[PDB]
Amino acid sequence: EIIEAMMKTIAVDEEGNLDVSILEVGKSSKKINKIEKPEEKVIEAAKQAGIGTKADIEKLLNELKSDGRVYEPRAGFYRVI
Amino acid sequence: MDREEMIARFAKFLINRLKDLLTVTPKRSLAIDWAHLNSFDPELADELLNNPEEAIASAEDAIQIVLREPPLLVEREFKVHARFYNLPKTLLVKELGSEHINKLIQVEGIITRVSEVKPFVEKAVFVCRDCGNEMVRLQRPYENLVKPAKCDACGSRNIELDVDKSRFLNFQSFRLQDRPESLKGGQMPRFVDAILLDDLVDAALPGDRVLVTGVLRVILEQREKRPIFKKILEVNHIEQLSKEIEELEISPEDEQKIRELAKRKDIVDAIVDSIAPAIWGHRIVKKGIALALFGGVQRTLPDGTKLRGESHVLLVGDPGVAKSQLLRYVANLAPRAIYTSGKSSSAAGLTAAAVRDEFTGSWVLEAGVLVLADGGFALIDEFDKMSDRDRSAIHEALEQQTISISKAGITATLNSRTTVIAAANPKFGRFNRHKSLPEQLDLPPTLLSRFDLIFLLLDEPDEKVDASIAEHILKVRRGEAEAVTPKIPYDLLKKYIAYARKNVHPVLSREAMEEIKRYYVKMRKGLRRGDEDGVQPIPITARQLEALIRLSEAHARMRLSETVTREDARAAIEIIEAMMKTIAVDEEGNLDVSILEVGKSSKKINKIEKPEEKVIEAAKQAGIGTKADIEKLLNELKSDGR
């Protein structure tokens, strides 16, 4: 009951994934970052695949710049590395 | 004390030992035995351990007289260093303390660090124009800079060094640590820095078992206190340790029960169940580790090459499958095992590297876990998180079993004859069954071509396999007897592995040769016809054929059989076929992963795909891939600039 009440008050995931180990959920996080990682796939894959909203993909491509998943030498054009 | 009398006593004991030296003139040293001197003159041999400063000097001048007096006397009286290789007691690096200072000791261990061939001046003649030219202030190579404050002859202070008349000698400083084979029980890698002189320099490499016997000297490196700050063993003689002392020994009463255990039925099943009894399942992984412990025969061909005799294992899987625990139980079960992590906690944590010492700033070659465990095992946990320097040298240490470093003024090659039973974690958190192994593994694709066994300890939810592991963990926590205890005790099994890796050397038989041949040709043409008009898949490579023979000989050595029985070669096929499913089979067809990938499809699509608003549409109606697949294809192409 303590373990059950802990998982409920945390809301760790929809399917109860162990986000405490990877800091990512399979459905809402791992599936999106797997499909995400001129600008061919930056504009096309964001539309025909329906990966997410404009604000949702913006934070993912931003975090991809730090982890090394999206590289863009120039500001006008952005690419995925 | 009675130095002149000791010279006469040394000359009395000195003559068959000096007789062969009288023949060989270029020999610049003389190997003298302490037990021989103890038989001739026990009181003289006792002074060797008590006052080694006056004993070595008096013995050198004494044997010089025993050299010039008889015939065949050399013209130039070359320096004859008294090398006492044998001693009545053998000390340990951990047992060594401040009590044995200025005493002739014989400490055993393994060399980890070593310096270059640094020349040092023996007779430091200082050039003083005013006066006092040939004056010598005898300095030792480890000692600090010696400089007189004033000339006693004329009172001048114009002091300088005369390196034209100075007689320089060779000098090398190494680090002797505890042997990880047996002295690792103390769990303290204590070190005693030692020095080397002429005929001792370049006499041993790092990661080698040596038995040094010298005088324990001291050095006042710091001026913060009058007492010494660091002790340095002045090595008088160096010698590599014998085989019996550097290998596991078995009692004669145990040699009978080890042979009795070999005659016991289902010996293979007993050893598999005896390896990590706490963890549930993974019997294929347990048998694969068992084949790695009883490594194959290592033979050398007369053509110069040496056939490999090790089987490296890699345990890839999601977190929570007790893949790190499997590297623990084997760490204590294996005879010579160094349990370590992939994290580069030191400059030479994984592979031997070069680092400048803190004493004189000179680069010293420090060994690693793949060097100290030579002729043994090295269980590397978290193999996917390694430094770039270690990742570049493991490609050679796993196949050629050599580590050739030629940087930082240190050029040499080591012997990395270790069985790397490693375990890596996927860089995506959990391993996906829809992607190949190097796609989710941080290890390079060429590095995977070295491991003979790669098991996938994946986590799969199933009511049958989860209810068994749940009740098994409960039995382990409850303290159940048969749930934690092995069928073969760890103490006896540790000797059983050393007995097989030393005495039993199986040889291939005609029955097993036909089984290895029929299996290799059976895999051929398994999937090559599939990917026609392009890169045809190679289901099995000749590299894996050598790995199959190593596993077939591993199963014969585990049974303590001097021949590879047809049943032994069949057992290695099941383990290979089981790994096939993990990689290169039962996944993207055969040839999967291989060197880099199956290519059957990926490579095939690569050649077809090979201001870009037109090329995205061109790939659409081409039908080579869906809009989602052709999207992810160019992300990997943009990664390499394509």
Ligand SMILES: Nc1ncnc2c1ncn2[C@@H]1O[C@H](COP(=O)(O)OP(=O)(O)O)[C@@H](O)[C@H]1O
């Ligand atoms: N077959 C098994 N039997 C018993 N315990 C297991 C088994 N598989 C996984 N475990 C459990 O997994 C937990 C973590 O093990 P660990 O060695 O840390 O795996 P990893 O390092 O991959 O996370 C342990 O508490 C252990 O009890």
